[PDB]
């Protein structure tokens, strides 16, 4: 299937956290690594988005509405896909993974436990890269932004991605006539986790103790 191929090929290249050796194992250290990784990640993501079949056909506004409505679901999806092979650990980056003890010391015991909830489901399903990249696009198109100008357009963006998921699924997983649906039914958990995080790193924004870059802010406040 064309859309699924195009989407594999468009996946942006890996990225490293590069924690700093000048600081000791501190929470404010960690939280800044993530808010750093996340910012560099967001620029990578805005580039990716332009290559999703049709997303460019939208308006700069619609595009921004979708992206600033779904960007955190897309960051979490990446973390989730990377951790599929790991146990109770969260591959935030290749050179920066976590585990209970670690994440619990960074004040994210609950948030990352939810993200490991996603992992478990996808693990149990045996999520594929074909499915992952299509789900990620479907979650940006199905962002539920309340400011979209052209709604008929955005609903077509969703239908091509949706039809792509369904084909792929019917061709590759004919033994589970309900596989595409099961993939779709995990988006509610994603939406939930996604806003739990955005609301959380918004406290850590306001408080003022952690340093954040320009994009990760403009997004974490819209």
């Amino acid at each position: 299937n064309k859309i699924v191929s195009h989407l594999l090929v468009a996946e942006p290249e890996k990225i490293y956290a590069m924690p700093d050796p000048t600081v000791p194992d501190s929470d404010i250290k960690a939280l800044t690594t993530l808010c750093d990784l996340a910012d560099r990640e967001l620029v990578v993501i805005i580039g990716w988005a332009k290559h999703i079949p049709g997303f460019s056909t939208l308006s700069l506004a619609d595009q921004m509405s979708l992206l600033q409505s779904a960007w955190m679901e897309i960051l979490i999806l990446g973390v989730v896909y990377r951790s599929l092979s790991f146990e109770d650990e969260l591959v935030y980056a290749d050179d920066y993974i976590m585990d209970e003890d670690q994440s619990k010391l960074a004040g994210l015991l609950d948030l990352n436990n939810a993200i490991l909830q996603l992992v478990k489901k996808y693990k149990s399903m045996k999520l594929e890269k074909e499915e992952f990249v299509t789900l990620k696009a479907i979650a940006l198109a199905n962002s539920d932004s309340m400011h979209i100008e052209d709604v008929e357009a955005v609903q077509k963006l969703q239908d091509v991605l949706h039809e792509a998921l369904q084909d792929y699924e019917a061709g590759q997983h004919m033994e589970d006539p309900r596989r595409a649906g099961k993939m779709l039914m995990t988006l509610p958990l994603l939406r939930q986790t996604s806003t739990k995080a955005v609301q959380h790193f918004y406290n850590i924004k306001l408080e003022g103790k952690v340093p954040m870059h320009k994009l990760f802010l403009e997004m974490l406040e819209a």
């Binding site: 805005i46 580039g47 700069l60 992206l67 600033q68 819209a222």
Partner: peptide, 11 residues
Amino acid sequence: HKILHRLLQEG
């Protein structure tokens, strides 16, 4: 809403 408007304007 400014940074993201630039990156998007690239294409």
